Ligand binder design. Structure first.
Ligand code: MG
Ligand code: ZN
Lengths: 221, 143, 94, 1111, 170, 56, 14, 110, 55
DNA sequence: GCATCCGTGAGTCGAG
DNA sequence: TATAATGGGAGCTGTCACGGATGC
């Protein structure tokens, strides 16, 4: 029930590394050149550092700061680019009627083992969730019709099937293959991820895509 | 994004990438007016070609063209958009020589004109929807 | 949230169509002074003052409330604009 | 209160005068106190000398002198005058072969003076000239990035004094020199300098294969005369190489000490690097008939010796603080002096021809304007010349020790990448690692370390103590960053018995890198930990416990602390807080031992030993650049005996001579109903009750009356169509009366303007007719109090044309200034911080009875959410809070120095002693453990906080030693389930207050060309709905909202007018029309010869100018 | 730059419902001024609009019935809050405002994440949607309570963080 | 024990099942109680709360 | 470029 | 004169002209007022007969923007100039009555 | 009529003179004393328009 | 076909 | 409205990475 431990575990605040710096040792620091010092800071923030340790740490602090300062503009610029490319793209109709589609793999070939291993949960969820089915799919005695927007549950089901070797990949409608002019169609786009339902025709999909891709920009290290 | 612990739907990245692939390079005009090596939108060539082949003419041979978000952005049909985004003088001179007309398809164009945008409550789909109470309804039903 | 928002989204093929219907209806209410309303006296949206409860001045609140009832009809090309405006001016003069 | 200081580290020397970097620099630059014949050739004296003599008649410089200021500082600030001294120059005009000399002392205008504390007054407003860091001139060698094998030799002079030159080996093997972006073979220049193939062959031959890449037959044939002209033709085309021109150009490029000035520091760097002796700061010399080389051959020798690896030849770091120097105010100002001077000389030469050739006095020959304007330019529109930041004494003291990469002859920020920003190992004891701006400027702006000094050459030096044998001398050597790299330097905290090193193994640095060493190998040792950090950083106690990233914010924010009417020094101090009040002149002190004669709110009269009676006026309620009140208050009483250096008065934000930025409040670290959510802070109404965090502020309002072509602007109490209610507080002349309380809308100074050309509308005529009244001649232009502003009128000033001593800018009849004061209580939205980087806005002011409180009924002052600590890793605030508790009960304050201070054991002991007071009294007063304290103790031992089975008192003490107490929720009376951290924390009220920042607008001022609303609160203008905000509306698919933003709410004129009128009449807003800025775009494109036409769906043109622009 | 746009410091509003914000009286007086004039005319607070505006011009001339009228003016209406950088569409959200004394804007704890807002001095800008259409768009499409899931992933954006987790977990 | 993830999932599921208007209500509830409890729970930080393992 | 240079040259032609 | 493009701040973000208001084009408020005035003058000219309203409209230039001599208004109505003078004066007098009674145009005192 | 398109093209000297309400023959701007716009200069009313409406 | 030149970009809002 | 006078003068350097054209 320790306050640090609790705040971390709950996800209220804090993470393991920070807790480490508070309680255990501070760790190794890096010179400005990028290569790390031979002696680590042994002190914790509880114990307090030595002026030498402290100064040693300042290099990293600063490097990080400047990094963030620059990445910020890099990301900003990126976002503006993306917005400029995607802006005209809007949901302009319910069905472009295309027969085409894209095939989302549940298995990624592992090069370390030269074998095949199931994709991670979140990866697959990101590939499948709220997508309309391009083709009918039957796994574990459940029929998933064409035109069916996959619920998070639907996706979990499909994963479980893929664990029973029932299905290796899923056919799905997608903007890549959509044949709507000057935009996209409801079916090819899928869920308005914000409402967990079919996207309403007229939603500005491009701008949303740009904002979505770019907003985390400053977080990528 | 995954490495950085960021949940982001493939959908969006796909939306952008599709715009990266929006263009093609011409390998043979066949019997078309277009000339070899010249870039244009996959849409436009698919349409033209269907006109040719369906009219009994030789089709145009085209090659897929990948180009980054910036170049693609500057290559958009709308000159208001392109001239807004970057390379204003270039875009504008190349546009003015050609005497381009902007059809106001995109958000940017309309924002610039102060127009009501083609998305949301401005979408032609829902834009014209009417509301009338039953009373007035039957009332006009007489004709 | 707005009351019955989920139902309202239920009513339409596109959320933006909901928004349009609501906005237009509100414009109607304002134009004809609320006297064209499909709400009955006990359904009339109310507002707290120092004096007491008076009709809610907010036409959009009204509009959505009305929409919930189903007393309202919406869609495209229901009636020519002339006929609409004029029949309404006959039924509820300004 | 008793003051206990921790730590055994002894400071062998105190901190240098903190503003000496400014003060000493300018002092040396002016040399005003030095007698003209005793002056060294530096600063102003150097400039004059470099400019003169003015050749062809010959005008020569003898000496110069500085007068006294025409007005005192206070006079200057009041009148909007620069504080300056008159500069005169004694010049003698000499006719050569004509014998005659005509000598005169000409007036060159005024030169701004630096004040006692290191600032300037320029046009009535205080300014600081920030020191500028840059690459030291010299000769450096940096590895070519394209080829690993080949290095590049760079020759860099002082900025604005000659072009940089680059020497490279080349792929082919021929040496190349780059000057002004043109490369040519170095051998040509070598020849021009009188070098012969032989002379070179013996010199550079030792390094094989390179010399042959040097040798070119044709050039060797030519000699200097042939080769000089060849070179000249390489340097510029299409210009005749008349030999005198070639000599003039190459001389002006290299040998001319006037056009090409290496650093004196540059000179030294060259000498030390290449092991040579320069006869001057020039690259080459003209002696007798021929060019003579100095720098080139040695740098070429070094370059070659480097390319082929030769022991003893180094590559240059170029971010090493040995190769980067500081240009202080003296150097910068002097630079501009030299420029304006060179221009003045240009004018002299120009007038040495036209006009009377025979009758010229030096007065006739010389024009000041170039000089006056060069100096005025530097002090007035320069980037390094900044509005002085004096929010509080520390603000300015720090502003002065600021170091900037940025500025003329400086990095642009596209220039600035990671290398420059970084904290270099040589910043140790020179530049502070912590204190730097947050964001875009990170690494560029920085602060000087506490013990650091900038030397004559502009290199930053740091003190160390000599260690010979095992003994540590008290002798301090100030070292440059380069010299420092020679020695093994022990850490200050290394244990000592006497002057002897007490440890078998000590921590030392060899060239910045840490290593464990024997006392035998220790050459020097740090003076103190303080030396590693800035003055601001040195004010953070427990700094060793704070993560650097937050310490940074602590430092930076102390600069933002507002001076409070009841200000206190922190209960925990680092021990620098007194000397800061000292070195920044805020507090007033006694000159010599003496006795206080008189003591008033306005002045203090002291009789010294000398018998002489000195009177000290006190600054009272004077406004600062930031609007915070600067006033001093007497800290002594009549007949009191005071020694030399004793405190006579307190500055703004000091307490008995100790720096007082905030207040010490009783704080509890616990969440509170989400009101301290995400850094927000919860405050006790008791704080306002006792006027904690209340601060005085003065705003200055100004208005002018001018001569219109339509008539005079009159400042009068007579304003057309105004009630007596409106004019009530206005005196006879129209100016609000001192003492009057003014609110938004109120008139500060009445003023009438003459109405312009009047086109009375027919409506105006019918109306005017109906009421029988006549339209007045004058409009009402009186100055009113802006929205959200106001207070008490503390001052007025009035200046009229043609009254004694006053002259106003042409056309200006009169100028009035109203000073309005306000006493600001702490409120919701206001910003508080501590020295550890904890900062937050006040979200809730709770009535005392809701405040968590101790069993004895004492309520807490502030409630800080603990969630703020773990992520931030700033533990200093925690220890500060604990020791703050102990102090709270023991009635004492502490000094806990950085990196040598109170360790937690000692804090625990003090805590125990405090507990005895806390609980002991209670026991004596006849009370036992409360029923609730038992429950809390239960849950506590469930938390492993106390030892089970021990007594309630023993356990409560066990918690107190951990800094925790039983806390009662004021709402319920029930306790907080766990024991909670309570203690005294030092917290400041920062300069950011909602009062300043709150703003809103319906409609207002629009812009000339665009017709879009103006920006900024002061212009009363709309907020920028930018590209990104638009994107946001687009994504929501909120069309009509967006369209409003783009039309009705901005630059659609018809639209915004119609909207306003409709909303006024309770009608729905109209359809938006075309935005005026699109019309602006169309016309701006037409001006560009491009035809832009809006079209039908039928392609027929559409006229958006509505016929107005078409014939 | 737009009309009817203000700015102030933000401060946490633990007590408000997800669809609300604290909007300082004075700010509201300015932002909705025209409306407040018309209303001031409907009630007899002033002879007409031109008079009303003068009454609002001098701060000391402002009676309490003015405030009461203002409460009537903003009824049902929402305003847009925006923090910069506006990285995604959730950088602007609509809230029905609750007039408060004091000078800072009160923001709901659950929306801070989407705004990347916090309370170390963050400042936000307010905007008044004018038309029935704009107000409709705001209340239906942009209302905070109607956007609870990220458009990026569809994962909840409005969720317990910090203090809420600390209590619930406890 | 309820924490970041669990609660997120709760919210999402409620959004799917109950619907948004209710989910809003649930969010205000979680907010209210969460705060209320957080304050009385007696969470705090003293220096002693950074616990150095004997293993260090 | 540098029109001054060019013109000076054209002048030096006569 | 000084440049509207004179930079404000060490950042290239703002120009001097950016802080210069537009004193020419009427404010939405001013415009509003100027229309309200027309509507109120018209509302006040309805209490007059069309002739005694038209005499004032004509002589103060509310129409065509020109003021007519009493003689010309007399010619337009067919009355003697002195007649038009007296019906103009009685018109204006009735206007003043309506005003002292109703308190409408007062706020346009400015 | 409603605007559905925006064309941009080169202008011929003919078209440029078409737009033009007059030629600027003088580098003058505003009269030094009166401050009224100079005749045939950059700010002329005869060319660009009246400074005051309907006057 | 690769070297190298010129030209164009490089977050937002705020205050000032 | 006339002695003769005849080719300028300053510069500003510590980014970085791209597309596209131009030249070797
Ligand atoms: Mg913040
Ligand atoms: Zn599709």
């Amino acid at each position: 029930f320790n306050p640090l431990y609790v705040m971390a575990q709950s996800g209220a605040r804090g993470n393991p590394q920070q807790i480490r710096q508070l309680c255990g040792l501070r760790g190794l620091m890096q010179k400005p050149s990028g290569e790390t010092f031979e002696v680590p800071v042994r002190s914790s923030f509880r114990e307090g550092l030595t002026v030498l340790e402290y100064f040693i740490s300042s290099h990293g602090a600063r490097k990080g700061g400047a990094d963030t300062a620059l990445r910020t503009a890099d990301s900003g610029y990126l976002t503006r680019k993306l917005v400029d490319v995607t802006h005209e793209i809007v949901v302009r109709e319910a069905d472009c009627g295309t027969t085409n589609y894209i095939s989302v793999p549940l298995f990624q070939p592992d090069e370390v083992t030269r074998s095949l291993r199931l994709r991670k949960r979140a990866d697959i969820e990101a590939g499948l969730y709220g997508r309309v089915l391009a083709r009918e799919v039957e796994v574990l005695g459940v029929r998933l019709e064409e035109g069916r927007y996959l619920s998070m549950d639907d996706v979990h089901l499909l994963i479980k099937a893929a664990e029973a070797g029932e299905i290796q990949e899923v056919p799905v409608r997608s903007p890549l293959t959509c044949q709507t002019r000057y935009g996209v169609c409801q079916k090819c786009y899928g869920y308005d991820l914000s409402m967990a339902r079919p996207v309403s025709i007229g939603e500005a999909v491009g701008i949303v895509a740009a904002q979505s891709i770019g907003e985390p920009g400053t977080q990528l290290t | 994004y995954r490495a950085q612990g960021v949940k982001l739907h493939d959908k969006h990245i796909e939306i952008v990438v599709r715009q990266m692939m929006k263009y093609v390079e011409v390998t043979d005009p066949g019997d078309s007016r277009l000339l070899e090596g010249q870039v244009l939108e996959k849409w436009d060539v698919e349409a033209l070609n269907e006109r040719l082949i369906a009219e009994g003419k030789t089709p145009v041979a085209w090659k897929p063209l990948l180009m980054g978000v910036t170049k693609s952005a500057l290559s958009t049909k709308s000159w208001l958009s392109a001239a807004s985004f970057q390379n204003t003088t270039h875009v504008l001179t190349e546009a003015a020589i050609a005497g381009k007309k902007d059809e106001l398809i995109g958000l940017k164009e309309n924002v610039i004109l102060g127009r009501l945008i083609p998305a949301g409550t401005g979408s032609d789909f829902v834009r014209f929807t009417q509301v009338v109470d039953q009373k007035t309804l039957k009332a006009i039903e007489e004709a | 949230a707005e009351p019955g928002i989920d139902k309202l989204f239920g009513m339409v093929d596109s959320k933006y169509r909901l928004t349009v219907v609501v906005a237009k209806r509100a414009q109607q209410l304002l134009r004809h002074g609320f006297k064209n309303t499909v709400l009955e006296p006990e359904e009339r949206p109310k507002m707290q003052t120092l004096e007491g409860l008076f009709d809610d001045p907010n036409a959009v609140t009204w509009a959505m409330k009305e929409l919930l009832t189903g007393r309202l009809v919406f869609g495209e090309n229901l009636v020519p604009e002339d006929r609409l405006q004029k029949e309404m001016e006959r039924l509820y003069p300004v | 209160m008793e003051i206990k200081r921790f730590g055994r580290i002894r400071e062998v020397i105190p901190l240098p005068p903190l503003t000496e970097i400014q003060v000493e620099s300018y002092r040396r630059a002016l040399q005003a106190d030095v007698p003209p014949e005793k002056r060294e050739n530096v600063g102003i004296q150097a400039a004059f000398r470099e400019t003169f003599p003015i050749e062809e008649l010959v005008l020569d410089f003898l000496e110069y002198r500085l007068g006294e200021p025409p007005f005192p500082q206070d006079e200057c600030r009041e009148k909007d005058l620069t504080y300056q001294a008159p500069l005169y120059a004694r010049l003698q005009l000499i006719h050569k072969d004509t014998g005659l000399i005509k000598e005169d002392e000409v007036f060159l205008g005024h030169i701004p003076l630096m004040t006692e504390d290191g600032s300037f007054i320029i046009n009535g407003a205080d300014r600081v000239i920030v020191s500028q860091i840059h690459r030291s001139p010299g000769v450096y060698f940096t590895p070519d990035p394209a080829r690993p094998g080949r290095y590049i030799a760079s020759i860099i002079p002082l900025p604005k004094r000659g072009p940089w030159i680059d020497l490279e080996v080349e792929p082919n093997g021929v040496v190349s020199m780059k000057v002004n972006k043109r490369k040519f073979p170095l051998v040509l220049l070598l020849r021009v300098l009188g070098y012969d193939q032989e002379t070179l062959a013996r010199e550079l031959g030792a390094y094989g294969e390179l010399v042959q890449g040097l040798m070119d037959e044709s050039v060797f044939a030519m000699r200097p005369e042939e080769a000089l002209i060849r070179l000249f033709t390489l340097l510029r085309p299409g210009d005749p190489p008349k030999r005198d021109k070639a000599v003039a150009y190459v001389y002006g490029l290299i040998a001319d000490p006037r056009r090409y000035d290496l650093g004196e520091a540059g000179r030294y760097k060259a000498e030390e690097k290449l092991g040579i002796r320069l006869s001057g700061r020039t690259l080459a010399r003209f002696e007798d008939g021929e060019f003579k080389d100095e720098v080139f051959l040695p740098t070429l020798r070094y370059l070659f010796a480097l390319t082929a690896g030769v022991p003893g030849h180094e590559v240059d770091d170029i971010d090493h603080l040995g190769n980067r120097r500081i240009r202080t105010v003296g150097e910068l100002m002097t630079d501009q002096f030299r420029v304006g001077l060179a221009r003045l000389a240009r004018g002299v030469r120009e007038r040495m021809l036209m006009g009377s050739e025979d009758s010229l006095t030096p007065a006739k020959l010389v024009n000041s304007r170039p000089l006056e304007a060069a100096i005025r330019e530097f002090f007035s529109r320069s980037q390094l010349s900044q509005f002085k930041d004096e929010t509080n004494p520390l603000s300015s003291l720090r502003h002065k020790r600021r170091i900037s990469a940025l500025g003329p002859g400086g990095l642009t920020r596209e220039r600035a990448g990671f290398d420059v920003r970084d904290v270099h190992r040589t910043h140790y004891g020179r530049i502070c690692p912590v204190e730097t701006p947050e964001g875009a400027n990170i690494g560029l702006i920085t602060s000087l370390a506490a013990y650091a000094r900038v030397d004559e050459l502009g290199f930053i030096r740091t003190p160390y103590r000599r260690v010979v044998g095992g003994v540590v001398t008290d002798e301090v050597v100030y070292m440059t960053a380069t010299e420092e790299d020679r020695y093994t330097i022990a850490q200050a905290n290394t244990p000592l018995e006497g002057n002897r090193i007490a440890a078998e193994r000590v921590v030392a640095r060899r060239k910045g890198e840490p290593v464990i060493v024997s006392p035998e190998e220790v050459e020097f040792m740090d003076v103190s930990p303080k030396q590693v950090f800035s003055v601001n950083t040195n004010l953070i106690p427990f700094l060793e416990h704070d993560d650097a990233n937050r310490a940074l914010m602590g430092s930076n924010m102390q600069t933002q602390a507002v001076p409070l009417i009841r200000a206190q020094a922190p209960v925990v101090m680092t021990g620098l807080e007194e000397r800061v009040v000292r070195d920044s002149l805020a507090a007033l002190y006694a000159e010599e031992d003496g006795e206080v004669a008189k003591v008033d709110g306005n002045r203090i009269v002291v009789r010294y030993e000398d018998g002489r009676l000195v009177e000290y006026p006190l600054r009272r309620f004077y406004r600062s650049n930031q609007g915070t009140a600067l006033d001093q208050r007497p800290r002594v009483v009549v007949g009191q005996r005071v020694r030399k250096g004793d405190l006579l008065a307190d500055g703004p934000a000091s307490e008995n001579g100790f720096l007082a930025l905030g207040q010490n409040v009783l704080v509890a670290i616990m969440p509170f109903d989400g009101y301290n959510f995400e850094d927000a802070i919860v405050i006790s109404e008791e704080l306002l009750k006792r006027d904690f965090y209340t601060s005085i502020h003065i705003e200055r309002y100004e208005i002018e009356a001018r001569d219109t072509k339509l008539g005079p602007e009159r400042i009068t109490r007579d304003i057309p169509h105004l009630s007596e209610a409106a004019l009530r507080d206005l005196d006879e002349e129209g100016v609000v009366r001192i003492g009057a309380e003014v609110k938004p809308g109120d008139i500060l100074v009445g003023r009438t303007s003459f109405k312009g050309e009047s086109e009375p509308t027919p409506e105006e005529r019918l109306l005017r007719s109906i009421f029988g009244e006549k339209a007045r001649d004058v409009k009402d232009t009186s100055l009113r109090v802006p929205p959200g502003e106001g207070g008490i009128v503390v001052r007025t000033v009035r200046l009229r044309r043609g009254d004694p001593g006053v002259e106003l800018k042409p056309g200006v009849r009169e100028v009035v200034r109203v000073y309005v004061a306000q006493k600001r209580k702490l409120q919701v939205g206001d910003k508080l911080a501590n020295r550890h980087g904890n900062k937050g806005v006040v979200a809730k002011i709770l009535p005392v009875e809701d405040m968590p409180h101790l069993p004895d009924g004492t309520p807490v002052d502030v409630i800080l959410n603990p969630l703020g600590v773990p992520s931030r890793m700033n533990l200093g605030q925690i220890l500060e809070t604990h020791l703050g508790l102990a102090g709270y009960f023991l009635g004492q304050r502490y000094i806990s120095p950085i990196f040598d201070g109170a360790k937690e054991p000692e804090i625990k002991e003090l805590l125990a002693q405090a507990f005895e007071v806390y609980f002991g009294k209670r026991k004596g007063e006849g009370f036992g453990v409360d029923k609730r304290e038992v429950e809390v103790l239960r849950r506590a031992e469930k938390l492993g906080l106390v030892t089970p089975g021990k007594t309630p008192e023993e356990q409560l003490k066990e918690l107190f030693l951990q800094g925790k107490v039983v806390l009662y929720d004021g709402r319920t009376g029930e306790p907080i389930e766990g024991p909670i951290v309570v203690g005294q924390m030092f917290i400041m009220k920062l300069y950011h207050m909602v009062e300043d920042k709150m703003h809103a607008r319906s409609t207002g001022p629009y812009s000339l060309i665009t017709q879009q609303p103006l920006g900024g609160k002061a212009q009363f203008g709309g907020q920028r709905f930018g590209e990104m905000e638009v994107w946001a509306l687009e994504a929501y698919g909120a069309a009509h909202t967006l369209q409003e933003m783009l039309t009705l709410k901005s630059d659609d004129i018809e639209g915004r007018n119609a909207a306003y009128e409709a909303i006024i009449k309770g009608e729905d807003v109209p359809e938006p029309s075309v935005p005026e800025s699109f019309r602006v775009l169309v016309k701006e494109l037409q001006a560009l010869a491009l035809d832009v036409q809006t079209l039908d769906e039928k392609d027929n043109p559409v006229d958006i100018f509505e016929g107005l622009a078409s014939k | 730059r737009v009309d009817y746009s203000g700015r102030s410091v933000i401060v946490v509003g633990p007590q408000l419902k997800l669809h609300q914000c604290g909007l300082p009286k004075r700010m509201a007086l300015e932002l909705f001024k025209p409306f407040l004039l018309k209303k001031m005319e409907e009630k007899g607070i002033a002879p007409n609009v031109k008079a009303a505006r003068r009454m609002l011009e001098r701060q000391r001339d402002i009676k309490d019935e003015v405030w009461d009228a203002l409460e009537e003016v903003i009824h049902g209406k929402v305003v847009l809050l925006n923090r910069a950088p506006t990285l995604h569409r959730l950088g602007i959200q609509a809230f029905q405002p609750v007039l408060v004394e004091g000078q800072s804007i009160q923001l709901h704890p659950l929306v801070c994440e989407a705004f990347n807002a916090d309370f170390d001095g963050d400042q936000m800008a307010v905007h008044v949607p004018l038309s029935s259409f704009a107000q409709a768009e705001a209340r239906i499409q942009m209302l905070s309570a109607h956007n609870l899931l990220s458009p990026a992933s569809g994962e909840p954006l409005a969720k317990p963080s910090r203090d809420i987790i600390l209590g619930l977990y406890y | 024990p309820q924490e970041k993830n669990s609660l997120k999932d709760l919210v999402y599921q409620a959004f799917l099942r109950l619907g948004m208007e209710k989910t809003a209500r649930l969010l205000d509830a979680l907010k209210y109680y969460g705060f209320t409890f957080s304050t009385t729970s007696g969470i705090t930080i003293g220096i002693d709360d950074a616990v150095i393992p004997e293993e260090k | 470029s540098d029109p001054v240079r060019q013109y000076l040259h054209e002048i030096g032609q006569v | 004169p000084v440049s509207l493009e004179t930079p404000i701040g060490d950042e290239k973000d703002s120009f001097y002209g950016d802080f210069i208001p537009d004193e020419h084009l009427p404010s939405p408020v001013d415009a509003a007022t100027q229309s309200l005035l027309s509507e109120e003058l018209e509302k006040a000219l309805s209490k007059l007969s069309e002739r005694e309203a038209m005499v004032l409209k004509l002589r103060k230039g509310l129409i065509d923007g020109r003021e007519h001599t009493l003689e010309e208004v007399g010619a337009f109505f067919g009355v003697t100039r002195e007649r038009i003078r007296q019906i103009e004066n009685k018109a204006l007098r009735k206007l003043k009555y309506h005003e002292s009674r109703t308190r409408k145009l007062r706020d346009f005192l400015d | 009529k409603e605007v559905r398109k925006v064309r941009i093209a080169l202008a011929s000297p003919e078209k440029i003179r078409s737009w033009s309400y007059g030629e600027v023959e003088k580098p003058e701007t505003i009269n030094y004393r009166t401050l009224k716009p100079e005749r045939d200069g950059l700010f002329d009313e005869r060319i660009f328009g009246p400074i005051k409406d309907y006057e």
